[PDB]
Ligand binder design. Structure first.
Ligand SMILES: *[C@@H]1O[C@H](CO[C@@H]2O[C@@H](C)[C@@H](O)[C@@H](O)[C@@H]2O)[C@@H](O[C@@H]2O[C@H](CO)[C@@H](O[C@@H]3O[C@H](CO)[C@@H](O)[C@H](O)[C@@H]3O)[C@H](O)[C@H]2NC(C)=O)[C@H](O)[C@H]1NC(C)=O
Ligand SMILES: *[C@@H]1O[C@H](CO)[C@@H](O[C@@H]2O[C@H](CO)[C@@H](O)[C@H](O)[C@H]2NC(C)=O)[C@H](O)[C@H]1NC(C)=O
Ligand SMILES: O=C(N[C@H]1CCS[C@H]2CCC[C@@H](C(=O)O)N2C1=O)[C@@H](S)Cc1ccccc1
Ligand SMILES: O=C(N[C@H]1CCS[C@H]2CCC[C@@H](C(=O)O)N2C1=O)[C@@H](S)Cc1ccccc1
Ligand SMILES: O=C(N[C@H]1CCS[C@H]2CCC[C@@H](C(=O)O)N2C1=O)[C@@H](S)Cc1ccccc1
Ligand SMILES: [Cl-]
Ligand SMILES: [Cl-]
Ligand SMILES: [Zn+2]
Length: 586
């Protein structure tokens, strides 16, 4: 009967709110205070939430969702039938929870030490070395050292993690954990759709890569850069070479049109982490969207503690499943890169507030890419030179074609360079999960993809025992990655649509949607759906059509594509890395 199924979902919602709120609290308390005691409590709460998931999931599987008429009830029940790791026998469940905590903790406490010298943490110390050092050997020390300490230490856990996450997936009716993850998109054509989008971005990426490679050749020397080969992976300003904008100084298209040092401007003008989040809050409310609650300011961790606590620094946003308590945990540094991250995280909080009155089972983004995209959309407007000048972080840069191309390059170094990285991470993990890549070949297959998609090579040959994927947060934390590929594509579609709704004319990259209530309304209507409808409906509400499409990103960067093609042709660049086997001689 429809009536027993409606009652079931009402009971599930009531009880899940309580249990999920308790689990979220214990998880937060460990993430913001890594201790033996908080780990023990977290593992205990893990068994408590598993008992609830098993109880209600077992009930849900007694309903034949075929017979169910109401589609929202059918949708909730189908979801609750997936027990996730609560499908595991008790011993394997305890083992999985411990392995996950061990991997997460290992990553978040790893340090890289000089001999009889200081020990560096990833945030801020190694991040700053990668961003600012311009000495090959110092960058190599940080790049190799991080992999030696964090990556190699994850390897002992990863095969058993794979076994257990796959076992749970099979117990819930999937073939492996990658199948489970991909199912979040409810899109049978997902793999083909993502491949087509990746291929559309190749002209831009290959041209950007060749131009940056030439600039690296100029700085690091002809003996260290092959103009027809892959780029050494430690030279791009970022530990993972996933975003390249920190080497803007090495690649600036028009050096005669310099930009104000934004870090020094933020520091000289007294910006703090709290100010950064307040500015993001102001952008959301300028669109008519919701302010974060007072409680957010009391309870969030917006900077690394100075009091002796060890924490998980990697920035993240937290819903406590009570409609009131939402928090960010970020070890914020005062610079423009982290201002963008603060917007990314504030977008999650906005989504949490928008869907807070849906049943908890539907309190998720339309798909995981939508969740990661919202804050980045607003940050596209914040990042415009006009907006940054309004914040007194740049001088006036308008009315200058040189400044225009410089800005597009700054944006491409992050947004375009990230496309191949974000594509490859779960290409690797899906093949680990499906058994195509074994522990014998984890690292070799990672580097084959880093070459194939990003055109990068490791500066030091890898050795048996290396596990470089473990040195990237999302791997030991079991956070899917294709969401970020989707996000980077769709955030430009959203920007284009919101700019049109705001009445902007002229080139897309000049748009700033600040204060547009029409733009806010598009976003709010879509976010309020949560996970209640197939994601093409939310896509339609924002953009006027239902597909994912690279057209908006291509339009944004069209003037830079034209500039890059002319520049690369002038210098005779060979796009790609036809000398694909090249690696550094020294
Ligand atoms: C299929 O069932 C859904 C879900 O119904 C809700 O959840 C069930 C478990 C039961 O507890 C129901 O009693 C309960 O309504 C129906 O969706 C719901 O429809 C109602 C009626 O339009 C929506 O009410 C609105 O609520 C807002 C505030 O939240 C008011 O301001 C509005 O004026 C309006 O009254 C409700 O939001 C909506 N809920 C969800 C989660 O979608 C759905 O109508 C039903 N389908 C059919 C064809 O009957
Ligand atoms: C970090 O975690 C430790 C361990 O849970 C906290 O110390 C506990 O604090 C509670 C309440 O303050 C006491 O009831 C326990 O007896 C304490 N346990 C130990 C082993 O000291 C500590 O307060 C936490 N720090 C922060 C800043 O939250
Ligand atoms: O993405 C996430 N959670 C995903 C992880 C990848 S798989 C996916 C599909 C199958 C069911 C369930 C499973 O893990 O088994 N599930 C998840 O929880 C976290 S970051 C955000 C989120 C939280 C709650 C609900 C939805 C999203
Ligand atoms: O997404 C996240 N954090 C950001 C912070 C930096 S910006 C952003 C965009 C670029 C791609 C990706 C990157 O840095 O690898 N990324 C992030 O990881 C968090 S909300 C993911 C998470 C969710 C729940 C629990 C734990 C983590
Ligand atoms: O939300 C996530 N991961 C969830 C997936 C859905 S189930 C949930 C409840 C039971 C315990 C635990 C489990 O069984 O894996 N768990 C998860 O890890 C990831 S994406 C985000 C995240 C990562 C690290 C710390 C905090 C958040
Ligand atoms: Cl790597
Ligand atoms: Cl995903
Ligand atoms: Zn995020």
């Amino acid at each position: 009967d429809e009536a027993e199924a409606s009652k079931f979902v009402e009971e599930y919602d009531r009880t899940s709110q309580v249990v999920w709120n308790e689990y979220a609290g214990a998880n937060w308390n460990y993430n913001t205070n890594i201790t033996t005691e908080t780990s023990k409590i977290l593992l205990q709460k893990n068994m408590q939430i598993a008992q609830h998931t098993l109880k209600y999931g077992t009930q849900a599987r007694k309903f034949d969702v075929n017979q169910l008429q109401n589609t929202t009830i059918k949708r909730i029940i189908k979801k609750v039938q997936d027990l996730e790791r609560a499908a595991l026998p008790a011993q394997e469940l305890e083992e999985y929870n411990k392995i996950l905590l061990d991997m997460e903790t290992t990553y978040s406490v790893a340090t890289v030490c000089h001999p009889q010298g200081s020990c560096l943490q990833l945030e801020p110390d190694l991040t700053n070395v990668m961003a600012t050092s311009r000495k090959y050997e110092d960058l190599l020390w940080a790049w190799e050292g991080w992999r030696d300490k964090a990556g190699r230490a994850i390897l002992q856990f990863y095969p058993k993690y794979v076994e257990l996450i796959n076992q749970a997936a099979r117990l819930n009716g999937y073939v492996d954990a990658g199948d489970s993850w991909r199912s979040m998109y409810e899109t049978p054509s997902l793999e083909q759709d993502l491949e087509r989008l990746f291929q559309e971005l190749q002209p831009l990426y290959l041209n950007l890569h060749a131009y940056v490679r030439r600039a690296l050749h100029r700085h690091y020397g002809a003996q260290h850069i092959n103009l027809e080969g892959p780029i050494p992976a430690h030279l791009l300003g970022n530990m993972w070479a996933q975003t390249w904008s920190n080497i803007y100084d090495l690649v600036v298209p028009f050096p005669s049109a310099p930009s104000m040092d934004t870090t020094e401007a933020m520091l000289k003008q007294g910006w703090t982490p709290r100010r950064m989040f307040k500015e993001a809050d102001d952008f959301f409310t300028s669109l008519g969207l919701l302010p974060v609650p007072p409680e957010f300011w009391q309870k969030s961790m917006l900077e690394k503690p100075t009091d002796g606590r060890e924490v998980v620094c990697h920035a993240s946003a937290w819903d406590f499943y009570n409609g009131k308590d939402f928090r960010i945990k970020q070890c914020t540094t005062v610079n423009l890169e982290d201002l963008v991250v603060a917007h990314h995280e504030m977008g999650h909080i906005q989504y949490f507030m928008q869907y807070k009155d849906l049943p908890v089972a539907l309190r998720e983004g339309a798909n995981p890419g939508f969740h990661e995209a919202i804050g980045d959309v607003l940050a596209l407007s914040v990042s415009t030179p006009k907006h940054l000048h309004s914040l007194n972080l740049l001088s006036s840069e308008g009315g200058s074609d040189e400044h225009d191309i410089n800005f597009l390059m700054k944006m491409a170094l992050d947004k375009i360079a990230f496309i191949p990285f974000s594509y490859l991470v779960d290409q690797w993990r899906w093949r680990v999960f499906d058994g195509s890549i074994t522990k014998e070949n984890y690292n070799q297959e990672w580097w084959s993809l880093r070459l194939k998609y990003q055109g990068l090579c490791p500066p030091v040959p890898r050795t048996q025992g290396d596990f470089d994927p473990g040195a990237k947060f999302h791997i030991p934390s079991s956070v899917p990655y294709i969401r970020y590929f989707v996000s980077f594509i769709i955030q430009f579609q959203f920007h284009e649509a919101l700019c049109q709704a705001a009445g902007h004319t002229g080139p897309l990259h000049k748009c700033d949607i600040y204060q547009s209530k029409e733009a806010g309304q598009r976003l709010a209507t879509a976010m309020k759906l949560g996970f209640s409808r197939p994601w093409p409906e939310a896509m339609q509400l924002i953009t006027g059509q239902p597909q994912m499409s690279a057209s908006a990103m291509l339009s944004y960067f069209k003037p830079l594509l034209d500039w890059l093609r002319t520049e690369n042709e002038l210098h005779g660049e060979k796009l790609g890395w036809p000398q694909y086997n090249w690696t550094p001689n020294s």
